[PDB]
TrEMBL record, chain A:
Gene: afp7
Keyword terms: Plasmid
Top-level taxon in the UniProt lineage: Bacteria
Record protein name field: Afp7
From TrEMBL, chain B:
Keyword terms of this UniProt record: Plasmid
Protein name as it appears in the record: Afp8
The keyword Translocase is assigned to this record: no
Coiled coil (residue ranges): none
Source organism superkingdom: Bacteria
Length: 57, 132
């Protein structure tokens, strides 16, 4: 919107190092994915104590 | 000759080797009713393990799982069986004045500078080539 109506395909850009100084190739995907999902996961463990009855993890 | 009479040291080594004969542990649950010299007895079991056993120590073991578990200990690990811890070196010492032997030998009272004991005296035996 606000300029024009045309599809923006997603682009897969690849490097060789972490920082991005050395570039590999790149490709833009036809037929956009229709769903993306980002999944988080943070791992906890219940701390144990034999003195008190406070309950944390 | 280690002591005056060797009755007690002969009884003592025979007793410290008996304690290696039966040794193990009884994992109980949580009591302060036991002590390292209590001599408890096992009664309700089969013919293998029934009888009075004398303890050697208690371990308390507080933790999150298992709760509180007063482990009992039976038996003593091992023994060296020396009359005294051996010193196998040659040492030198100076003769210390004169003091008569209360054990009625002819032992000559010396010092040993390996000890830092300038005041106390040590009676020692004298070796002669011939004696007779």
């Amino acid at each position: 919107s606000l300029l024009e109506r045309g599809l923006s395909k997603l682009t897969l850009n690849a490097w060789k190092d972490r920082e991005g100084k050395i570039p590999a190739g790149s490709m833009s995907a036809m037929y956009n994915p229709e769903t993306i999902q980002l999944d988080y996961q943070t791992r906890f463990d219940t701390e144990d104590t034999i003195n008190t009855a406070s309950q944390s993890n | 000759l280690p002591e005056a009479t060797l009755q007690t040291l002969s009884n003592s080594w025979l007793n410290y080797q008996q304690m290696t004969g039966v040794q193990g542990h009884i994992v109980l649950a949580g009591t302060r009713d036991f002590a390292p010299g209590e001599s408890i007895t096992l009664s309700g079991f089969g013919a293998g393990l029934d009888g009075t056993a004398m303890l050697s120590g208690v371990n308390q073991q507080f933790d999150t799982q298992y709760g509180w578990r007063s482990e009992l200990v039976i038996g003593l690990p091992a023994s060296m069986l020396e009359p005294a811890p051996p010193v196998r070196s040659l040492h030198i010492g100076t003769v210390a004045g004169f003091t008569a032997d209360p054990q009625h030998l002819d032992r000559i009272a010396i010092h040993l500078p390996a000890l830092n004991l300038p005041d106390s005296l040590i009676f020692a035996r004298l070796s002669k080539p011939w004696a007779s």
